[PDB]
Ligand binder design. Structure first.
Ligand SMILES: [Fe+3]
Ligand SMILES: [Fe+3]
Ligand SMILES: [Fe+3]
Ligand SMILES: [Fe+3]
Lengths: 191, 191, 190, 191
């Protein structure tokens, strides 16, 4: 079986200046493309050869997991952003964030802090369980909450390639700027 | 007339990371407010009391010119930017830039270079004469091309307060980044 | 070949008037550049082996900009010391007093001059041959030695000198500077 | 004790193009400075306030360890390079390599492979034990062989910030180019 490189729902420069055209090209066209190609080559002749992506992330180990996890991570990452959006979440998700975190602003800083204190490469995930309970997951390297049976809602990539060309060492500034391009209509639909 | 501090056509954090929320707050909320306040003070009891800003900039000198010039400069500066824009110019302007500079990319390095070589405080302006001929004007301090009878189209502020909080001494990096927030629709409309 | 002067104090010694981050950028990046540029530009010119003062006195354009800024900062950074301030004594103390009326009066005029300078520049306290004092407003890279005067005390009003801590509050910064001025060093220049 | 930011034994642009002037400015001037500043702040009032770097790396945990390990890692990193060097090792070290590795070229490929396959952020270290035995240690994130009682000889930084501005995703290319700027006289002196 074969996994495909996702098509971006927007132009490569649609997310500037928070995510530059150059970053999109490298992040999507080089990094993600590599994870997809690796995954495809590594699952041949294995029990994951014909499994759906989520099943692979939940059960694989080693190189297969690293590539499958990164593939799922970026697929979700790239499709949750849209220019001219941002703002705050409404409806179901919006209510749960206030109840569990007190307010959207309070949740944002906890999210940002989680992403900033994650040492090295990794991901910060907003996830939920079957009951709708929200949690903030700090996932080192290729980690994803589906491995814990959780539902990944919003993920911020803190691997340096996600922001280096524009922010260099200023990861904190990048995380606070990312909220401006989050399409909550897409995120709410994952809840 | 009473010159007013213009309202921003976007949110204070809309131009991050090229121009951060803090910088917009000080640049617009503090520096520009001071120029407007000083201008309103100095023209009292003078031939400029009831003149429009453009006339003041073309005919004044000394303190009146310094504040009038900075007011006009910043009013044009802040209104020319937008997030999710950038790119290249189109229409006659884009056409004129190619015809007169060879290409947009050549225009940029030439504009960037003028900005980086300006010693001290100043502005670099893309201006047009009555026939649509373009020129790059290096303006020390509060200078503006309208003083030469030209039409100011796009201006980059290289006073250190425009980029210090984020870039410190790296003026060149700041200039390179500015292109990503230029709303060419607005600039084309001035042509 | 000119060198980047060595600070006679720790980088965080002048905080908060001049923060640790500012000293690092002002001295470690800005001054270094003016020096690296001055060395480069004078190579193969009549100023290749002249002394800094003569360069600032005869230079033009690029060479002068970097020369004036190097001399300017050299006197700037070396005129401060933590826990000093106060008032001037001896010769200079009497001069200022006689020529300005009082020290408070002088500080006032000096602050106004610095707040008034539009754009980038330096406000300088200079002295002529007969020890007559004058407050010189120098745009950009200017320095009183150009006019054949003796530079005693200079405040850097380029925005990079205070923006990290004071942003647009230049006046507040100039009022605070007096607290870290080492008058003993200023007297030694008069 | 207050740890200092090490002085570079060469110009900031001496290592270009393998390590650009900008990468040195960001890598040494921003990343290393932050790790040092952070370390100095965290150790105050702790059992490590007066301890030497190696001791801190060997016994500390959490944030102190992360910053101390990165400080030690980078100090050895920046000092082992010199323009106009490279080549192969000689002496007791050049001998030990050829011996337990086959040849310098065979050690190189092995080292390169270690660095390219380390997933996420980390360091690849050539370490020596008490008897002079050589080993290639893959250290994730802030790891250093000193923590294991070994002697660090040559370390390549594979955190993306070490090569992204110039190589972007091409880590393998960067590791290949690193050999050209290694000063074996320095390395040899550590054995
Ligand atoms: Fe990524
Ligand atoms: Fe400005
Ligand atoms: Fe300065
Ligand atoms: Fe590093």
């Amino acid at each position: 079986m074969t996994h495909e490189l996702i098509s971006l729902p927007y132009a490569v420069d649609a997310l500037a200046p928070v995510i530059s055209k150059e970053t999109v090209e490298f992040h999507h066209g080089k990094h993600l493309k590599t994870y997809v190609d690796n995954l495809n080559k590594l699952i041949i002749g294995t029990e994951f050869e014909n499994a759906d992506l989520n099943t692979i992330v939940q059960k694989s180990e080693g190189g297969i997991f690293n590539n499958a996890g990164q593939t799922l991570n970026h697929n979700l990452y790239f499709t949750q952003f849209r220019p001219g959006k941002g703002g705050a979440p409404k409806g179901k998700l919006g209510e749960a964030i206030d109840k569990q975190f007190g307010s959207f602003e309070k949740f944002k800083e906890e999210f940002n802090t989680a992403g900033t204190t994650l040492f090295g490469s990794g991901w910060v995930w907003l996830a939920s369980d079957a009951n709708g309970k929200l949690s903030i997951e700090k996932e080192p390297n290729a980690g994803n909450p589906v491995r814990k049976g959780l539902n990944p809602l919003l993920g911020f990539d803190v691997w340096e390639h996600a922001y280096y060309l524009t922010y260099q060492n200023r990861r904190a500034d990048h995380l606070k700027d990312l909220w401006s391009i989050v399409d909550w209509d897409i995120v709410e639909s994952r809840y």
